């Protein structure tokens, strides 16, 4: 699906492979890795793949294709590097400006429940427990989530 275009230093590939083995749930079939949950590691590898993008980087896999069948990541490694180098992401000030309009008082914060709702429903599909653990701690007494600090913590960590 993707051609070999750019390769980084092999030690970076080596540590990516090490993390994959960490996530490798196949004891004897360690050569093959999860087809669909590799995008979850790509999420964990300092990248932020959107749902549609993390789907068609895999050529529109099916749910059975996503989970049942296996795949060799090293074929996808050039495409993972391509996704990393696309830089199809906004900036921190861009993020805070975008989430600023989602307010009705301009206090520098956003109410928690509507933030969870838009994160789960308005945007890409995400389980709720994920959103409460995302703003776990970021949640305050009156619900006015500090969206600037929250988003800087997110993109930084």
């Amino acid at each position: 699906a993707s051609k070999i275009k750019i390769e980084f230093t092999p030690e970076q590939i080596e540590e990516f492979k090490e993390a994959f083995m960490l996530f490798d749930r196949t004891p004897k079939c360690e050569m093959k890795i999860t087809y669909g949950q590799c995008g979850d590691v790509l999420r964990a590898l300092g990248q932020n793949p959107t749902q549609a993008e993390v789907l068609r980087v895999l050529g529109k896999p099916r749910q059975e294709e996503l989970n049942t069948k296996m795949m060799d990541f090293e074929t996808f490694l050039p495409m993972l590097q391509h996704i990393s180098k696309n830089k199809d992401t906004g900036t921190y000030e861009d993020f805070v400006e975008g989430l600023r309009v989602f307010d009705k008082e301009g206090n520098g914060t956003v109410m928690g429940a509507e933030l969870r709702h838009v994160l789960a429903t308005l945007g890409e599909r995400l389980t709720e427990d994920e959103v409460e653990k995302l703003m776990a701690g970021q949640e305050d007494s009156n619900g006015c989530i500090n969206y600037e600090a929250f988003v800087k913590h997110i993109m930084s960590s």
Binding site: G90, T91, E93, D94, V96, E97, G98, V101
Partner: peptide, 13 residues
């Protein structure tokens, strides 16, 4: 304040 999202780079914060 409304349409800054279009080009946040312009009109710096």
């Amino acid at each position: 304040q409304r349409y800054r999202i279009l080009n946040p780079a312009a009109i710096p914060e």
